[PDB]
Amino acid sequence: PRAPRTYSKTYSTPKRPYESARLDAELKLAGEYGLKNKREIYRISFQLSKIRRAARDLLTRDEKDPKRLFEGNALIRRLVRIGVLSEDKKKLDYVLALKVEDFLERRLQTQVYKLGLAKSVHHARVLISQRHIAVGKQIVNIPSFMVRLESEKHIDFARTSPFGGARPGRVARKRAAAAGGE
Amino acid sequence: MGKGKPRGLNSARKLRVHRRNNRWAETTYKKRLLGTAFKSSPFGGSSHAKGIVLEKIGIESKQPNSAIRKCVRVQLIKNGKKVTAFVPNDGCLNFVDENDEVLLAGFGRKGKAKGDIPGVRFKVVKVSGVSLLALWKEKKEKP
Amino acid sequence: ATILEVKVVEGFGTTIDVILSNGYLREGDRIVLCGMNGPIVTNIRALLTPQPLRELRLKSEYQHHKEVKAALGVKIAANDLEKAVSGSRLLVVGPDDDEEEMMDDVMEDLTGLLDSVDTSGRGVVVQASTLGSLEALLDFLKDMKIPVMSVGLGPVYKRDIMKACTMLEKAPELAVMLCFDVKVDKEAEQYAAEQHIKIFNADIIYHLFDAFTAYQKELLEKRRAEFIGDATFPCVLNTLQIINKRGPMIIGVDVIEGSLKIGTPICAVKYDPATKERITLLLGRVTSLEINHQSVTEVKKGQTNAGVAMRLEDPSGQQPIWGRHVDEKDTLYSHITRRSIDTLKDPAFRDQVPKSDWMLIRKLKPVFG
Amino acid sequence: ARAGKVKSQTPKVEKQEKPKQPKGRAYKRLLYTRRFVNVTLTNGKRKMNPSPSSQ
RNA sequence: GGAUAGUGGCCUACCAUGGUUUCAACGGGUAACGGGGAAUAAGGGUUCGAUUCCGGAGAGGGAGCCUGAGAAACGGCUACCACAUCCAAGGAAGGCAGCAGGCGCGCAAAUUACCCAAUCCUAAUUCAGGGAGGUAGUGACAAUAAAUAACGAUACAGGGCCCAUUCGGGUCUUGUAAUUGGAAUGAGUACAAUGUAAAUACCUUAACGAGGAACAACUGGAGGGCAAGUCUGGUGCCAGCAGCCG
Known part of the structure; x- marks a missing residue:
């Protein structure tokens, strides 16, 4: 009886179930970026919807007045920091027409492939899940990381682990012991 | 105006x-x-209720179609009133037995008749800690 | 490691009396015993001792031990053993293994054990203090030929009375409680009759046969007899004279063979003689009788030498007019052709019809056809 | 029978040793490659579950 | 005037006849504790709030008090009305809507565990105690994060096409095979050392750990609403499906 630990159901659902034009649209999004569920598309949909509602509240209020200016600026400073919104579009009205593709092409999933490293997209997710890729001096292992634009300069393979230095084989440990006999 | x-x-x-x-x-x-x-509303304004079987009655369906539907007469525990429930799937009433506890449920019409059955407003679900889905798909047998 | 009884005690619920040959036990380590319908694994709740007289007998107050050592008997309080049969091997599992196997060994001793309980039979219900007496009670009622349906343990509550109330429509005198040495709430006794059991509590065990059997013989002998009437017992009658011909008909008959009744269908046959017709009606039945001034039930075989006067009612069809259709010289008989023999049988009573009879149902038919 | 005649009366056909389906992301890539990328043959309108060309 | 810690019809004595009422009094019902709030979500609104915070009632049902600054106290007392123990039959002792646990009621809800290290709390009190409170167990109540294979060359064959004297190079890219090949990995198990009141568990890792037979995803669908079979064999107004049309 101290403090009920507050939680929030983030990701939501569509209104109609079997709308065939929507199903084809969501499939090609999964086809490009190799997502497992429909939930990872709805991940953006809810989180993006919150930003639009905040913009609608600040737009309808009068300009050159307090909150509108201060709250709206902090919203834009965040979206250019994360790297979703471009640097030549800091006008509030541009935030309304953002679209889901800008968020999905700003993850630790896609940015590893476009650097190089993995190749063929789906391989990149397997490298992230298996304890490779240290962005800072610490190994990240979530696909939905969201890279911070400034931090994209440091994306390399880890010091430890394969393609690094220390850890040699597992499969080569078979061939180390076996080939040594011959 | x-x-x-x-x-x-x-x-x-x-x-x-x-x-x-x-x-x-x-x-x-x-x-x-x-x-x-x-x-x-025979139940106590609730979702489910248990009862004991009295007899096994075959009820006739309505007009355009023609078939016997298979049903069970039940005495409810908490109320004491008597009702006529329905048993789904092929056979199934073989597993239900006579003189046994049976858990009932609604049909999904907010009362009222369902489809083609005259005055049958309940559905059989479980029989002594095992559902008719489990017994009909031979995965674990009755105790 | 052996179970002895399955007692239902206050506070703990379903306890188990064990007898220990050799071993150790502590308040915490789990066991693996045997259920009638489930392999059980569960912890020790508590551990008792008599200190130092009796095991149970009547009273109930114990010591509390953290750990015990063999060899001595002891009650074990525990959880998840609402059914847990006597004679099981109470194994232990400290650090290792999923044991069982003894499950299949001792579950063969359980399958061939409580087969007397007819799962969908026709009454009654038994409730016992211990499971040891419950086995002996079922085997006792097995040989006395009382059908036994359902079985349970502990005190009786209102939910355990409706347990045996599927037979209220059928019998209805085959739906009773045979409680072996346990009490009832009320609540339970304020639901019993009421509608309409009723309870027979006894703490011997051939009372709760004698109390049942003495009760049972009352309402099986209020079924047969009475039939009495409906069941038509045949007869033969010599018509001596005519007192009143019609409205209503009074005939001075004389009984030769068989019994008569208030409600014996009568048929005085016009002796065909070619077509085997008559035809089947002499109105009634016979409401009243008269031996001088006394109505009786009735004359058999030949109790009175003087002629008895009949009194026939008018139910179905035209009455045969006396003189034209029938006369004094015609011998009167019963209505029995076929469907009175539906009432014949009605097993267990027997008698009537008694073993001097009938004997005349070889004669019937024909007679008529 | 008057109680589940067709449940027992039918000819009993059994399961087969198929090659297992891949789960997760691999199944969605199948549906991506099947419909969109490879381009199935269609005369007029599309068809998801085909049939044998016979009456 | 009396009482009260103190105001007052709170209570008496002698007077006066007033007070509330279609702007709904008075009575009845509530499967009614009041709010801070929760659910749904254009704008307005509907429905719920036993329950982690604040206030008020009650300790089986009613009255009645003693001690203390503070009690009509109930893990204190005196009766009566229920229900209940132990009797050597003289009499003794009673109150889980605190914590576990057993009954019963039911559609419907957890272990008779470890400990005062934290949060605070009480005394004569740095030290003692605390089922307040914390730590495990049980736990598909909700919620957050996301393993079930990825890249190769061959083997099968399609797509682009320099040119299409016929070919075919195949220079570029793709999907199909119980072909195969090297590389990963925690799900596991496990010396230690962290962790902790002491232990589990997580986080870090010595050692061991994947080849389709496994380390194997279920759940409900495929006439219309509504995404998806005019597919073989059985069934023949029966057995069954079907929220509704059927």
Whole structure:
């Protein structure tokens, strides 16, 4: 009886179930970026919807007045920091027409492939899940990381682990012991 | 055209009281306030209820179609009243048995008849800690 | 490691009396015993001792031990053993293994054990203090030929009375409680009759046969007899004279063979003689009789030498007019052709019809056809 | 029978040793490659579950 | 006037006849504790709030008090009305809507565990005690994060096409095979050392750990609403499906 630990159901659902034009649209999004569920598309949909509602509240209020200016600026400073919104579009009205593709092409999933490293997209997710890729001096292992634009300069393979230095084989440990006999 | 109803700045009272009268002409509002769910509706205004089997009756379906539907007569525990439940799937009433506890449920019509069965407003679900889905798909047998 | 009884005690619920040959036990380590319908694994709740007289007998107050050592008997309080049969091997599992196997060994001793309980039979219900007496009670009622349906343990509550109330429509005198040495709430006794059991509590165990059997013989002998009437017992009658011909008919008959009744269908046959017709009606039945001034039930075989007067009612069809259709010289008989023999049998009573009879149902038919 | 005749009366056909389906992301890539990328043959309108060309 | 810690019809004595009422009094019902709030979500609104915070009632049902600054106390007392123990039959002792646990009621809800290290709390009190409170167990109540294979060359064959004297190079890219090949990995198990009141568990890792037979995803669908079979064999107004049309 101290403090009920507050939680929030983030990701939501569509209104109609079997709308065939929507199903084809969501499939090609999964086809490009190799997502497992429909939930990872709805991940953006809810989180993006919150930003639009905040913009609608600040737009309808009068300009050159307090909150509108201060709250709206902090919203834009965040979206250019994360790297979703471009640097030549800091006008509030541009935030309304953002679209889901800008968020999905700003993850630790896609940015590893476009650097190089993995190749063929789906391989990149397997490298992230298996304890490779240290962005800072610490190994990240979530696909939905969201890279911070400034931090994209440091994306390399880890010091430890394969393609690094220390850890040699597992499969080569078979061939180390076996080939040594011959 | 003043639209009948009073459109006054101090009309407040008549606007509120006129609608508490007209609210009584709606079935969901009327049955919630008066509370026939507690006083009627064989169950105790609840989702599920258990009972014991008395006999096994074959009921005839209605007009365009023609078939015997298979049903069970049940004595409810908490109320003491008697009802006529339905057993789904091919056979299945073989597993139900006579003189056994049976857990009942609704049909999904807010009362009323379902499809083509005259006066059968309940559905059989479990029989002594095992559902008819489990017994009909031979995965674990009755105790 | 052996179970002895399955007692239902206050506070603990379903306890188990064990007898220990050799071993150790502590308040915490789990066991693996045997259920009738489930392999059980569960912890020790508590551990008792008598200190130092009796095991149970009547009274109930114990010591509390954290750990015990063999060899001595002891009650074990525990959880998840609402059914847990006597004679099981109470194994232990400290650090290792999923044991069982003894499950299949001792579950063969359980399958061939409580087979007397007819799962969908026709009454009654038994409730016992211990499971040891419950086995002996079922085997006792097995040989006395009382059908036994359902079985349970512990005190009786209102939910355990409706347990045996599927037979209220059928019998209805085959739906009773045979409680072996346990009490009832009320609540339970304020639901019993009421509608309409009723309870027979006894703490011997051939009372709760004698109390049942003495009760049972009352309402099986209020079924047969009475039939009495409906069941038509045949007869033969010599018509001596005619007192009143019609409205109503009074005939001075004389009984030769068989019994008569208030409600014996009568048929005085016009002796065909070619077509085997008559035809089947002499109105009634016979409401009243008269031996001088006394109505009786009735004359058999030949109790009175003086002629008895009949009194026939008018139910179905035209009455045969006396003189034209029938006369004094015609011998009167019963109505029995076929469907009276539906009432014949009605097993267990027997008698009537008694073993001097009938004997005349070889004669019937024909007679008529 | 008057109680589940067709449940017991039918000819009993059994399961087969198929090559297992891949789960997760691999199944969605199948549906991506099947419909969009490879381009199935269609005369007029599309068809998801085909049939044998016979009456 | 009396009482009260103190105001007052709170209570008496002698007077006066007033007070509330269609702006709904008085009575009845509530499967009614009041709010801070929760659910749904254009704008307005509907429905719920036993329950982690604040206030008020009650300790089986009613009255009645003692001690203390503070109690009509109930893990204190005196009766009566229920229900209940132990009797050597003289009499003794009673109150889980605190914590576990057993009954019963039911559609419907957890272990008779470890400990005062934290949060605070009480005394004469740095030290003692605390089922307040914390730590495990049980736990598909909700919620957050996301393993079930990825890249190769061959083997099968399609797509682009320099040119299409016929070919075919195949220079570029793709999907199909119980072909195969090297590389990963925690799900596991496990010396230690962290962790902790002491232990589990997580986080870090010595050692061991994947080849389709496994380390194997279920759940409900495929006439219309509504995404998806005019597919073989059985069934023949029966057995069954079907929220509704059927």
